[PDB]
Each structure stands twice: as structure tokens, then as C-alpha cells.
Amino acid sequence: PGFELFGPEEKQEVADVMEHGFTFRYNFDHMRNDRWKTRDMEQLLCEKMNVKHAHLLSSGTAALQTAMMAAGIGAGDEVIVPPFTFVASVEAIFMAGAVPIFAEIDETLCLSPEGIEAVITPRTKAINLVHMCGSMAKMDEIKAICKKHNLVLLEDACQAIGGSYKGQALGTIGDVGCYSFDSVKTITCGEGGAVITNNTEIYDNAHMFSDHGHDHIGKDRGAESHPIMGLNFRISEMNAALGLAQLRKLDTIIDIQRKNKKAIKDAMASIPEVSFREIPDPEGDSAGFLSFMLPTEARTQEISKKLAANGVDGCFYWYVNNWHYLKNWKHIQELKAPAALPITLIADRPDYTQISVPKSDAIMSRTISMLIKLSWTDAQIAERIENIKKAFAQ
Amino acid sequence: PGFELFGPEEKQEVADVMEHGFTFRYNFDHMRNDRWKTRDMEQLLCEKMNVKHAHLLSSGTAALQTAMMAAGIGAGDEVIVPPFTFVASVEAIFMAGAVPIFAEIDETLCLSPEGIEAVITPRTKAINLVHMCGSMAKMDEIKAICKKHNLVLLEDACQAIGGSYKGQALGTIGDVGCYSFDSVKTITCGEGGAVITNNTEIYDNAHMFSDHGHDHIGKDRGAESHPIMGLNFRISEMNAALGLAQLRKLDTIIDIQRKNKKAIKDAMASIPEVSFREIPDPEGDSAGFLSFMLPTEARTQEISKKLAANGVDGCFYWYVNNWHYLKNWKHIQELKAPAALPITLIADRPDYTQISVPKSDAIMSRTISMLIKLSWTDAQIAERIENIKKAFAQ
Ligand SMILES: Cc1ncc(COP(=O)(O)O)c(CN[C@H](CCC(=O)O)C(=O)O)c1O
Ligand SMILES: Cc1ncc(COP(=O)(O)O)c(CN[C@H](CCC(=O)O)C(=O)O)c1O
Ligand SMILES: [Cl-]
Ligand SMILES: [Cl-]
């Protein structure tokens, strides 16, 4: 993760806000001395990712809530979502008053075309596609499903910035995409997120909705109009500044992940039991994780235990862990919250205790994902590889 | 506003994060060198405000959202709200799927006891009391209404931190209170706010809800439980470091506000035609604004113009402006948004184009408030006073 390359660039960029800038992302022209960090981050996103618009805001979660509202995805709408993703995917749908509809993942670890096909109803408004663990889904097929059924395609790219699919940056392919710059992402703001799109009406909705409907027109904040209601997901200039310094390092970061993942994957490919996640576009993998499969569930359990025992940290058996797989989200299953949620106001909706995702279970029960870190020396990679081989040894 | 005193302490507090701390408000013990800026600002809010609990998060708006959820205020609940407040108040209610119910203000410019009483129904869960423009409501009578009717008392202290009523810090009298530390408030985090409360159950719900239900128990983040669903309103350590430095200056800010307020008011009191906002606890006034009334709307319009023409800046005729009075909120009245808001799932919603708050209109159509700045010199004040005098001269 990006935090591993914290150096003088980050310190300097943030100190500039404090020394010459201002803390608020808008206005204060007179006294911010032309320091617009948020603005600069958004433009650097547009230029690096080759998208028309980027709107930076308070978190990746706030991104998803904002992207959904901005795209016309609201109260009562069905939104297809996978059962392997971070909890925020499902929380944002529920908070919107929308209805999550689980669809199956495939061997890409992301929504399957056929899975999506099978749960499309007429209530369906959107697909919430997640590029999990730094790689991507079968995008041409999913795009075609969304075009044929008239569905909004939202990309959650919060774990895969710098990845691409056929020369298109992840997050730029659907109607709208989201990024996270939380403290453990590829690139960080400490906290922050972005909504990205080539659709200007979506962008306008996004910047307005994340700032109380403020049109952001003119130089008098107080005099601005509010064509819509909204909320507050503004990001500070210090958070943006840190993000600006980090995004300037994204290419180095992706190259290190790619190099490190390759070396480890290459040596693991001589262990016959190991299968690897499917990658539709190998050139476009951001390489944040090496995801591998064992032949059976029991064997997966055993390898997970032995990786840990042999010092191979940063391995995630998502199937049994609490934050990335539906099966261990009883809280979500049973709509637990200290006040009534909007989803409770909808009668005709899934019983969330009774979701079956058999084909996701089949894959995820045998899947372990290893985090690819930036700090690793070649000696440390060699040792990790030896520890992996010892973990598989029999 | 606190931005007026930015100096070395704010620079130093944030540079301490970037040079020796970490960006994320939790965990990372091994590498943050004991810098817990978010933790410290929370503790300091507990000390200064004699409250048991403080939770710091991404904004004042997120504080309102989080406080409602944390106190049991949710979909279908009626929440009584003033027509004079920032838009965020009504936005936060709608987004919870709760039903804002407008009640009349009195000459305190806060909800009137009798206004509140006239609009209670069995569905009322809460009174959303706003301490507008730095001062308070008739808090003993309001608290009595909430006890007799078994209603949650939520305090929006987002514009009145440092204020008090009978020795009790504003935001601590009801069941839950809310602050803001946006860039133009009294005390700033750049962007930030907090939920304060003496009720541990409310606090626990607040810190969980604002971090995807994370329990925050133990040292391993991934091993934590999620008793409830949540969202992300986490605050960066950099935002917290700024608010920490600011919050240590709060006493000075408030002194300077009272002293400056008293100068202008003393002087305006000698203009026979002026009446002042009612202040239930004069020594508990935070003094962010001097608010005064004229006998007619026409005369208020006239004075507004003449004040600006004579260089009496910082004057807000809320009635006629976009961000703080129901009458100019067509967007809210007609529920304008790019996707359906959760309020739309409540089929016997009030019609928000038909709200009648005649007493509020009668006060607000004649009210003007003047922001008390901290930078003002003795001579700028003297010039201001004399300028106000010219404007009233007829
Ligand atoms: C796919 C996806 N969507 C949304 C988010 C939300 O991002 P933010 O934290 O900026 O709101 C994450 C964050 N990924 C989490 C970090 C979880 C945590 O510890 O907070 C992860 O997958 O580990 C994510 O991976
Ligand atoms: C009573 C009240 N509640 C909530 C908020 C929202 O806080 P936050 O901005 O942290 O989400 C404000 C903000 N004070 C506004 C400033 C609005 C702006 O310029 O954005 C005001 O009343 O002017 C407020 O005064
Ligand atoms: Cl992989
Ligand atoms: Cl997990």
C-alpha cells in the first residue's frame, strides 16, 4: 500500500496547505495563494486515467453513495452486487434506500456475466461491479448486458486503481466509477475517495450532491444556488494534498506490485496444486494481490493455517473472514442497526437471511489472497517463497 | 471564525502527524509513535465540555446523521426541526428516511416550546434543536417537553460551540449533541465534526456506525466484530491535528467574540428603533453573531442594503438568502434530487410545499445577523459602529 512510500513528497505537500494554502477546497481565492490541492488531484486523475471528470470527496464509501445518487440510483431500485466485496458495497446500497440483489462471482473473483443475467428483473437499475483484489471482471460481456438491459454500470475500483481492461483504466468503463484513498489503499489521502466519469451530468450531480447541492458557480459561496438537495462529503485540503503527492507515485507503485507479484507467482507455478485467479486482461492487472485456489476446501483450510505458521503474513482466506464475504455478515443478513433503516420501508424485497450463492461458495471456499507489499527486497521475496514452499510441503 | 487565528500551533500540530504520526485514526501503534490526534481531540472535548463521551468524524453533517442513527432516530420517525437553520439539518433527516416536521421559532431564533408542542404526534421520536448563530433556546422548557413526551433531544451545536445554558455546555443538555469543525466555524478541522453524549449506548452506536459497525475492541482491526451495519465518516489524523490546535484556542476565540459583540451591541442599543434577539442565558452566549430586528420587512430590506453600502460587511438577511431559511429551499420543498431519496418510501409524507410557519416568517422577515469576526482592531470596530450609525440615519 501507498503508505509504504511515505517520504518527503507527502510531508511537503501537506505542509504547503498549512504554509501558503487554505483548508477548504473551495473559494478563499484571495488568501489561499493559488494552492488548490483538491482541484489539482482531480485534474491529475482526469489526465492519468483519461476520463473527462473526477470529483474527490471524503471516502470511497462516500464515493459509492455519491456515484449512485449521481447516476440516478436511488430508493427502491434493485442493484446487483457481489457477495465477495468489502462491506461498504452493500452498506451504501442500503443507506440509499436501494435493494441489494446478490449475483454470483466467477473465477475472476468479480461478478459473473451469467450470474448477473440470472438475477436481472425489471426492478433492476444498476450493476455494482467490484474489481476485487486489484484485478477485473469480464468487462466486455458485462458492458453488453448493461447496454441490452438498460442498466447503469457502476465500477467500484476502490481496490484496483492503476489497473485497466483493454487500454481503459478501471473505473472509466461503466457510467460511473469509484476510488478509495483510505489509509491502506494503493494510494492514500489518509481518508478520501473519488467519483469518476465521462458523463458530465453525472459529474455535476456528484459535485453538487456531496456539498449540499451547491452549484459551485461564481466566487460567492453564499450566493450559489442548490438545484438539488445533498449531503457533506467534502474532503479537506490536507487530505487532498497527501493524495496529490501519492497519485504522482502511482506508476512506480503499480510497477513494484507487478514485479513482486510476478516473482512470487512464477515460483508458485511450480507447486502443482496451486491454481490462480482468472485474469481477463493480464496486462491490466494492478497486482495488489496474488489470489490462488486449492483443489478442496479442507486443503484450503490447511494451507491457510500453514502459510501463517511459516511466516507468510498478509494472506486472506476471505471465505472465513468478517469484512469481505456475505456468509459472515449476519449483521447485514439481519439488517442490524440501532435505528430503522430505509430498506425496512420496502415490503417486496429479499429475505437477507436466505441468500444462497453456491457458485461463489465453490470458488471462495478454496481461495486465498496474498497482499503484494511495496517494501519487499529481493532477499525477503526469496525467503517468502521458501516459506510458501514449506507451507505446501508434504 | 477560527481560521482567523491560524498560526504556528496549527502548522505544528499537522506537521507532527506528517513527520511522526500516521494518517488513520486507529491502530498502527508500532509506527505512529504514540500520535493519536483524533483520540486527543476527543478527550479534550470531554474535558472542556464536561461530557462523558466525544466522537470525532468527517463533518458536522455526518455528525447529525450519526447522532440520529445512534439515538434510535430512523426511518418513519418524525423529527421536529426549525425553519431557520442550515440545510444540512433537513438533509440529514431525509437521508435517514425520517420525516422532518417544521416547528416555529421564537425571538430566540431557536425552536419555540409552544411551536414544538403544536406539532407533536405519536410518530415524533425527536426534537432537532438548533443553537443558531451562536446562542440558545429556552432549554429548560424544551427539555421538559422531551421528558414528558418521551422524545429524544438532539442538539445541533454546529454554530454554537463554547456556548452554554446555566453552566451546561451547548450540546450536552439533551441526549446527544453535534458539533461542526468545517473551515468557517468557530473551531476548525478543515473538515470535521463530532457527536457528543453522556449516554454510553449512544456513543458506542456512534463510533460503530461511523466505521462500518467496527466495535473498535482489541488491537487487530480485521478481527473486530460488527454488531451493526455502518457507513464511513472517519476523520483523518491530519484534520484532527488541526482541530486539536484550534480547540485549545476556544476560550480566547469566545472571549474575543463576546468582547467584540458587546461593543457593537452596546453601540446599536443607542439606536432607538433596534430590538435585539432574545438570549435565555446571556453569559452562556458564544457571541458569533449580533442578531437584531427591525419593525417591518420593508425597513429590514432597506437596512440590509444600507449596511452593505456603508461597508458593514458580514451581514446576513437570512430570510432572503439561500442556505438558512425554509422559504428559499424549493429544492427541499419539492424533494429535488437525481435519484429518489429514502423519504419517498413514506407514503403519507407531509407536502413540503405547504408548510406554514407564519410566526417564523414574521420574526425572520425582520431579522438580520452580523458575524462577529476575530481579526477586528479597536479602530475597525469604531469605524464599524459609526458606519452602522450612518446606515440607520434617516
Ligand atoms: C471495494 C471497496 N469498496 C469500498 C471501500 C471503502 O473505502 P473507504 O474506506 O475509503 O470508504 C473499500 C475499502 N476497502 C477496505 C478497507 C476497510 C477498512 O479497514 O476500512 C478493505 O477492503 O480492506 C473497498 O475495498
Ligand atoms: C447548524 C449546522 N448544522 C450543520 C452544519 C454542517 O456542518 P458541516 O459543514 O461540517 O457539515 C452547519 C455548518 N455551518 C454552515 C457552513 C456551511 C458551508 O459553507 O458549507 C453555515 O451555517 O453557514 C451548521 O451551521
Ligand atoms: Cl491473482
Ligand atoms: Cl476479511
Ligand SMILES: [Cl-]
Ligand atoms: Cl444576538
